[model samples]
Target chain A: TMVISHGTLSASAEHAAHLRQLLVHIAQATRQEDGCLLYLVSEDLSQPGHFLITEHWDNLGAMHTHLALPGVTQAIDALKHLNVTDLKITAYEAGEAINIMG
Target chain B: RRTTMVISHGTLSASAEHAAHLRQLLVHIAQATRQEDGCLLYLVSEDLSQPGHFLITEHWDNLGAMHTHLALPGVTQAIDALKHLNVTDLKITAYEAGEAINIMG
Candidate 1:
């Protein structure tokens, strides 16, 4: 099974640009990690304050390693002052594919 | 093995009351989606701190299978059902990538 983490974050208009850069940096760095499968940071086209971060890891250990990284910690700290809102994050352990429409 | 996995992320915002129906529809959709041959996962979660805001995460074996799954009746039905709600925002994005890796050192 793989570990997937999706986060929804929002910031004020003034902080949007800065936040974007930080998230982009985090996403790029995380993707280069050994266990990282995917890392993406996307903006909501219709909403100014909305951003989403999606990450995929080979296992829980990989995800934990990511969480403990200095880059991850810095990103978290940077978000604290951005007056963020509606921050929702959750992880899932995805198993093999199966047919559901049978 | 370097099989491609397609990931989808979606967000929806409606009224607090309408959120109930949204959750119900997601349950129906998820059950049906999980049965697909290429579907690895179908998950739905609501932002507890933000009323009427929801997120959906999906994983598929590949782009072709994911595309076919999107056209399924259940998917359209669930999507059309949301029209009656006062939806403020709806965003869905897809990404393609190689399989997961074990980064543990």
Candidate 2:
């Protein structure tokens, strides 16, 4: 699973919502692809304008395929207009999750 | 109505020192919200493409509860901490669970 987190402007709720919509679309596509372990997103509770995204893939190869897809590119292309103040992407080894069932 | 939700997203500064600072804030937020009745999940991730960048994810039982969380003191502090670091490029997305499959061996 690939996990990403970042934050945006405190005042621009509109911008944040727009960006979220774009991501959900991208995630929809990611889910349709094979090997998605978990495709999820979250917003920061303490951070006013911050947001976060979490993704689970069977492996790096599957994640790569999802990114390389044209649909992924389309979603990214729309981000230029988003009031996304900053965006960060991270990768983690799957073995770390201790008890996902709870 | 169980809706999948994603609440906060943002990237901290690129400097290692800035990342360290951001982590401090993350710890505080995690501690306060870790056992909240509404929370489903919470976590932080550093950018592989850019080590200093970070992503946070949260899952809540519903939107109303998530909104209530935005008012909490811990969350307020997290936003305050971000300002000092000069954080930018943030996005918060809420979601409803779609199709999920499980594969285990």
Candidate 3:
């Protein structure tokens, strides 16, 4: 089974650029870990201040481990400086995926 | 009244043998739906690590547009094909999103 953590977040327009940089850094760091499949942070094209995060893992442990990382909270704390808001994340565990559109 | 966004996103699983069929079906669905009234974004991406897994993420201008898309024939055809065909494990959800607010402040 694979586990996925995804959903959206919001950052103030004042720091959208900085937030993007931090998000890219987090993705880069997480991808090097074991069981990390895909970690992406992308801004909504239609909304400048809104962002999306999608993280795929080999299993629960992999995702959980990433969550427990010190950097995870540090990232959260860092968002405070940017006045980020409207954060919503969902967790999903599913069997193997089928390429509905590849 | 403020404009809101409707996000439909989820994951699905199916037989690996049916990859080509699923691909074609979804691509057609995406193309048709995107051209419809108020589609903001429509995409389905396969998991790079797990080839058989997929994530479908789409955004609509509003709930009305999303419901309209659901009633369209292309969407209906996609549903029928997946139901009768080899696909399985469909767990998807849609959210009516609100304007971005400052919770941190």
Top lDDT hit: 1
lDDT of 1 by residue, B15-48 (tens): 8778777777766767777889799867665543
List candidate 1 stretches off by more than 4 Å.
A1-102, B103-105
lDDT of 2 by residue, B1-105 (tens): 122443333334436657677767766767677687678766565433345656656656655667677665565566667767766544444443322222110
Judging by TM-score against the true structure, name the best candidate.
Answer: 3
Per-residue lDDT tens digits for candidate 2, residues A1-102, read 333222222226768667656655665666778888556544454554455456766766787687788876676557656745355454433222322111
- lDDT of candidate 1 over A1-102, digit per residue (tens): 576676778888899878887777877788899789867776543344577677778987888988898977777878877766556765655554333221
Q: Candidate 3 lDDT, tens digit per residue, A4-87? A: 566577777778778888877878888999899878666543345677777667877887788788988898888777887667
C-alpha lDDT (0 to 100) for residue B96 of candidate 1: 63
Q: Please give the distance, in angstroms, between residue A66's alpha carbon in candidate 1 and its true position after superposition.
A: 6.3
True contacts kept of each: 0.00, 0.00, 0.00
Pairs that clash in candidate 1: A35-B103, A99-B35, A99-B36, A100-B35, A100-B36
TM-score of 2: 0.46
Better of 1 and 3 by lDDT: 1
List the candidates ranked by lDDT, beginning with the highest: 1, 3, 2
Candidate ordering by DockQ (highest first): 3, 1, 2
